[PDB]
Write a protein that binds this ligand. Structure first.
Ligand SMILES: CC(=O)N[C@@H]1[C@@H](O)[C@H](O[C@@H]2O[C@H](CO[C@]3(C(=O)O)C[C@H](O)[C@@H](NC(C)=O)[C@H]([C@H](O)[C@H](O)CO)O3)[C@H](O)[C@H](O)[C@H]2O)[C@@H](CO)O[C@H]1O
Ligand SMILES: CC(=O)N[C@@H]1[C@@H](O)[C@H](O[C@@H]2O[C@H](CO[C@]3(C(=O)O)C[C@H](O)[C@@H](NC(C)=O)[C@H]([C@H](O)[C@H](O)CO)O3)[C@H](O)[C@H](O)[C@H]2O)[C@@H](CO)O[C@H]1O
Ligand SMILES: CC(=O)N[C@@H]1[C@@H](O)[C@H](O[C@@H]2O[C@H](CO[C@]3(C(=O)O)C[C@H](O)[C@@H](NC(C)=O)[C@H]([C@H](O)[C@H](O)CO)O3)[C@H](O)[C@H](O)[C@H]2O)[C@@H](CO)O[C@H]1O
Ligand SMILES: *[C@@H]1O[C@H](CO)[C@@H](O[C@@H]2O[C@H](CO)[C@@H](O)[C@H](O)[C@H]2NC(C)=O)[C@H](O)[C@H]1NC(C)=O
Ligand SMILES: *[C@@H]1O[C@H](CO)[C@@H](O[C@@H]2O[C@H](CO)[C@@H](O)[C@H](O)[C@H]2NC(C)=O)[C@H](O)[C@H]1NC(C)=O
Ligand code: NAG
Ligand code: NAG
Ligand code: NAG
Ligand code: NAG
Ligand code: NAG
Ligand code: NAG
Ligand code: NAG
Ligand code: NAG
Ligand code: NAG
Lengths: 486, 486, 487
């Protein structure tokens, strides 16, 4: 008859790393790194995003003749734009403060197009000959649909003086442009005025522009250029226009209410009719883990980006008639620590739930604390800088690289320390049990040194159960042990 | 006759959290988070700040009639400004590079106002008619006090040519402006010349401006605009002015010496006549703790900002005829570890000075190291970007959020781990005392298993003090114990 | 007659600090902080940097007469420039977008100067009178060598129209400028046209300029000013020029290929003819340590910067014939970390245990190597390129750098203290385990003196002592002898 103390073992082949040792096999393990995604675009908090397909923000706003598909978007959460849009500006030119406009238009609560100046408001000017071959429509010359190009009528260009007095209860977005001619003859043929000017004024805007006649290289078969501008009109403000040539008047305006911020995503994947909380250009994430390695650029409440490919926390035991010194028993299934009994009455395994429950609770609490002690907040990441702003881009790159390195180091070191701590805790528990069974039986038996005790006397099944319970009668078998000795 | 080992216990109720269990009860604890402030504005290192009350920087500099009295305060550390100043730019207009001037005027030493161009220097121009109803003073039209508005005299406006040596030994700040008319008739009424220009030139400045005549919405009953500019004059440089209309000439200049930098605070709290080191918009904070959660915006040597509400370190034992594994001893005052003694003379308590002193020193060193290993530097945090610089503001917000998350996570994890270590550090010391006593005792007594030893022989107070001291003579009582063993 | 346990001890005086104790003497220690440099400038990955000596970037590009060092370096890794260059611009003026051009003129794969407009292309204009005393050369007036200052000829200034196709297969860098006069008389004497203009146009450029005539201060004896501009020409684009006065036509153009990105170093150290990997204004760093405290500004893959002065990691034993419970200063053992000292009638000796020593050294080495190796290092170029009117972004950058420095310093110090504390107990645990293993094998044949030794009742000789070290002991063989010895 003998009593031994051992620990649970199984056929698991999972491996973890510690500070001192590498490739240690454990019975159970858990991963805290996210590495999967659905590979589709999904709604952000129930708000459908805006997809511009092959168009661009400038082309969509100005009304490119090949980009009239999008006319109904009451609201959106973020904008998805392809990396190299095809139809951006049919007529060569530029838009002032393009990046700021895109950043402002990222997230819009309400959007509606209205007409502010009917085409009938120009009795003394021609409004039908302003077409170009650089903006074809069904094989015919056309122009932008949201603006009107005015030319001379009856060989005369009377001065223009009109004003608009805002009556809606929301802000308005208004766009206008100026055209640069090629030579004096073309300027005379188009406007009859050798020298022209444009004046725009509001409560806060004071602008004056003049044409720049010169020679330029051909773009899309056209040597002219067009420059556009934009502004925001207050609910009770008014805007005044005045020009005598080279003026592109506005026709439609947008009603905008903004109560948030976002950025623009460059991706080519398709919509998927799904709801998510975190979005990446390659897919969506639906994980509660504190770390991930999918993609740097993310929108929304997302885990943190790290370089490591594996972060495994050890939660089980060290995998491998004897005792705890040799190895772990495979015959026991219930519990982590227990006793293997053996006598003439029978043999079997008995577990100790008192310490197993405490160990399980401790490990679970450690894992839960590590997972849940992390704070996350809404963030938007993107590239919003042009050619002549490289210094700020480099600063942002330094930002992201430093944060990535810090997080990677912290996570790796924390995992490495915690694995060893858990292993040492398990060893401490098993030795605590071994000394708990000790110092109670006294000299009635002898310790073979292999984790087992050989009773000199005879201990019944009830006696062994009482030993497990922690209540043992030493004087009951003291004389039997004494006469048994030698 | 028995000796038992135990530890201190009291009526405390503080609770601390570990990595494995939540709010175990401990006897003593220390907080390392600061959550209190005096709620007043105080001097920074003995330098009084600048309080503008209901004015703005531009209004204070230009001399708004209903805003400023005189300069005062030749030096200051930071500027306190209300969220929405009332008196600012009575005449509608704008100031060029407002944000840069605001940032540069944060911390200034030896700020003094001097007069450079007396009003007697304009004998051929009118100087007593440049007043407007948009800037009333005691019910009468007035204008800015630091600049002069020039009008035509005797239906004429001769060209102006003036230069200024800077004979002072410090840098000089000069401001001037240009006025935009409303129509040709008004321009002729104010100035005889129909076309005007302004030329300003220094060793590093080359500027030429022209007025812009157009129709604008009326603000404060005025449709005109005034744009102002500023520059820094070197100690031995000169500035040349040349104009023939629409010119606002300077009259006063400021002598400025700068060494350092700070930021502008938006707050409404009052002055309190105190000297602090860290300042927040809601009050002033002084402490040695490494963390705080008062306000994100701070100026000076302030602790780090975290989101947590509680951060408590454990510096004591676990609270709850006895023994080690029963609990604590309420009656055992004056010590952490010690011996409970009971002979035929009587019973009482005794403490082990050495182990308690080592434990106290270790805990104190741990706490002091955690507190003092923090590096603090002077910093100024504030919002200094306009409406057309949203991207940089987003970048700054990303900076602040990332740093806050990193600090919060690291602090929480460190607190949990150190609490875990410190909570069970003392158990090893108590175990060491126990088996030291057992090693000296050997088999002269019997272990009851609850933490005491039942003496077979008689041990008087001298023998008991010898046992505590570490001088036990086995052969002296061995024969008596052998006879009593049966 | 007795057997004892102990550990190695020596004559080192290294000191380390733990969380609970300070100034603890240890047998062996290792530092993980780099504090040395060669004090020289070296090549970066085999690419020699560009050293401009006393000439600034603008003067080198425009062709300042006092910068006659026309040495050709087709490819450079970074630019070394003095804090206050002397020869920058002989004629007072400014260069548009100077900072962006300087940033773009970092590491360049290919660079060559070619001629695009010969002087013979101006038959109706004077090209020999464009000299000034502000740009002396051998005691004679001169001008920039890369541009031409056009003056009126035969009291006439015909309008200029010219275009240039880029027939090369690489990007082109072109510079031009405009001159500001002082008064009407000077303008008439120089160009004969009271009103002038300049027009420049490409596929993406549309610029128009007009001279500004005013009175300015005297700098270098000249009251005039000169403003220069630059642009990048695509491999199949063209640029058109048109002006009627105050025009400074380009003569030479730079043919450039750009792949990477770098920054500019401000230092005065000399060249060293070395090939390093990390660069610093005060020298070069060659180490694999994760931390350093040399200089905040670095270029390349460099360790992290901290404000600490000492970072020592404990890897040895607690430095100071009975031991194991009392002072373990067993100076006799010089062949291991843990072992036994034996003594009987035959003799004595300081034996050692190989298994425990191997386990301990492997564990400590693994810890040190893991801490050193788990560093992610990437190429980062750190500099300070911001003008006088951009102080807010500079303050933002300074705040970022300070925050990162504080985080790294605090984390490193706390980690070092915690790891020293953790390491200074594994040896104690091993010694206690060895002492326990020595026990429960002799049982009652020996008396545990408590001092860290066992005294056998029976007679055990060298073979029996070697056996008990080996872990094989015959208790019944000496059981009766221990019985008869027990009184
Ligand atoms: C008055 C006229 O028609 N003159 C003819 C020249 O324009 C023409 O030169 C060719 O012009 C081509 C493009 O001309 C258009 C266009 O962009 O399609 C024609 C449009 O009617 C005109 N629109 C308006 C509202 O005036 C438009 C406009 O003038 C410019 O876009 C101004 O920026 O120009 C094309 O570019 C050819 O490459 C160019 O040679 C010559 C020769 O074809 O004939 C003239 O009769
Ligand atoms: C010089 C004068 O008396 N001009 C008369 C016009 O002012 C007047 O038009 C009315 O002008 C009102 C405001 O005019 C002031 C003002 O701001 O109070 C009058 C000031 O004397 C004048 N100051 C100077 C130095 O010239 C000032 C100035 O002209 C403008 O501010 C320039 O920006 O204007 C108010 O705006 C009324 O709405 C407007 O009708 C006309 C018609 O009565 O008579 C003029 O003689
Ligand atoms: C052409 C000439 O000699 N003109 C004389 C004026 O220059 C002179 O005024 C004095 O000018 C001095 C410098 O004049 C130079 C120079 O910078 O050395 C003379 C150069 O020939 C001339 N170069 C060209 C290509 O025209 C150059 C140029 O005019 C200016 O740099 C334009 O910015 O100027 C010096 O500044 C003296 O302080 C100044 O008084 C007057 C009176 O002496 O006589 C003119 O003949
Ligand atoms: C730690 O103590 C807190 C007491 O503050 C316990 O938290 C409370 O839990 C009850 C129900 O369990 C809630 O109704 C209270 O609102 C909680 N208080 C706070 C301040 O959150 C907590 O349960 C204790 N820890 C554990 C493991 O039970
Ligand atoms: C402003 O005044 C100072 C003081 O008179 C001028 O500096 C002097 O200039 C003359 C001739 O230029 C020299 O001979 C003196 O030696 C200078 N004195 C000092 C103390 O430097 C200065 O030139 C004047 N400013 C301008 C633009 O002329
Ligand atoms: C640890 O295990 C992995 C997986 O098999 C193996 O690639 C690696 O080489 C192992 N480490 C060592 C030191 O052998
Ligand atoms: C815009 O219209 C409202 C409607 O009466 C008017 O009160 C307001 O003054 C108008 N705006 C301006 C600038 O006059
Ligand atoms: C996310 O995953 C959980 C399970 O982890 C699942 O129940 C849920 O449907 C998924 N989607 C959302 C939107 O929560
Ligand atoms: C705890 O005991 C101390 C010791 O006298 C006493 O001063 C204190 O008031 C007690 N606290 C409570 C809550 O009873
Ligand atoms: C901090 O302020 C408190 C006021 O509540 C004061 O008692 C204390 O002395 C101050 N500490 C220092 C170092 O000034
Ligand atoms: C310390 O001991 C080593 C070992 O022999 C010896 O080489 C060295 O000289 C000694 N140093 C001192 C200062 O005693
Ligand atoms: C630790 O040693 C250093 C160097 O000898 C000394 O400067 C310092 O004061 C010592 N610390 C203590 C607490 O004695
Ligand atoms: C440059 O030459 C090529 C050669 O065919 C020609 O196609 C191109 O049009 C030329 N550049 C311009 C601006 O015309
Ligand atoms: C850098 O230092 C290592 C270690 O001493 C050495 O092997 C290597 O040759 C050094 N490299 C250079 C370029 O000096």
């Amino acid at each position: 008859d003998q009593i031994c103390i051992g620990y649970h073992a199984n056929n698991s082949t999972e491996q973890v790393d510690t500070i001192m040792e590498k490739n240690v096999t454990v019975t159970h393990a858990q991963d805290i790194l996210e590495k999967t995604h659905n590979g589709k675009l999904c709604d952000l908090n129930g708000v459908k995003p805006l997809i511009l397909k092959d168009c661009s923000v400038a082309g969509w706003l100005l009304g490119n003749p090949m980009c009239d598909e999008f006319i109904r978007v009451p609201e959106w959460s973020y904008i998805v734009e392809r990396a190299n849009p095809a139809n951006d500006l049919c007529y060569p030119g530029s838009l002032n403060d393009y990046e700021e406009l895109k950043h402002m238009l990222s997230r819009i609560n309400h959007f509606e197009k209205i007409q502010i100046i009917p085409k009938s408001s120009w009795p003394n000017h021609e409004t039908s000959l302003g077409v170009s071959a650089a903006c074809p429509y069904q094989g015919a010359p056309s122009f932008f649909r949201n603006v009107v190009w005015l030319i001379k009528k009856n060989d005369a260009y009377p001065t223009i003086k009109i004003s608009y007095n805002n009556t809606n209860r929301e802000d308005l977005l208004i766009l206008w442009g100026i055209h640069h001619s090629n030579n004096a003859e073309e300027q005379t043929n188009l406007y009859k005025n050798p020298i022209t000017y444009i004046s725009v004024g509001t409560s806060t805007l004071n602008q004056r522009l003049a044409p720049k006649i010169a020679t330029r290289s051909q773009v899309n078969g056209q040597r002219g250029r067009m420059d556009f501008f934009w502004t925001i009109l207050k609910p009770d403000d008014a805007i005044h226009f005045e020009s005598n040539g080279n003026f592109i008047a506005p026709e439609y305006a947008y009603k905008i209410v903004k109560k948030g911020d976002s950025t623009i995503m460059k991706s080519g994947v398709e919509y998927g009719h799904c709801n998510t909380k975190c979005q990446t250009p390659v897919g969506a994430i639906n994980s509660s883990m504190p770390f991930h390695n999918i993609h740097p650029l993310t929108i929304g409440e997302c885990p943190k980006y790290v370089k490591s490919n594996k972060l495994v926390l050890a939660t089980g035991l060290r995998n491998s008639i004897a005792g705890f010194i040799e190895g772990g028993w495979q015959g026991m299934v219930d519990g982590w620590y227990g006793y293997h009994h053996s006598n003439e009455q029978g043999s079997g395994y008995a577990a100790d739930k008192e310490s197993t429950q405490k160990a399980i609770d401790g490990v679970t609490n450690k894992v839960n604390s590590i997972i849940d002690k992390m704070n996350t907040q809404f963030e938007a990441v993107g590239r919003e800088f042009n050619n002549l702003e490289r210094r700020i881009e480099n600063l942002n790159k330094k930002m992201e690289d430093g944060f990535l390195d810090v997080w990677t180091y912290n996570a790796e070191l924390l995992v490495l320390m915690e694995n060893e701590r858990t292993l040492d805790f398990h060893d401490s528990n098993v030795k605590n049990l071994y000394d708990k069974v000790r110092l109670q039986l006294r000299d009635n038996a002898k310790e073979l040194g292999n984790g087992c005790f050989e009773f000199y006397h005879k201990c019944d099944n009830e006696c062994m159960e009482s030993v497990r319970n922690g209540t043992y009668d030493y004087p009951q078998y003291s004389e039997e042990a004494r006469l048994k000795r030698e």
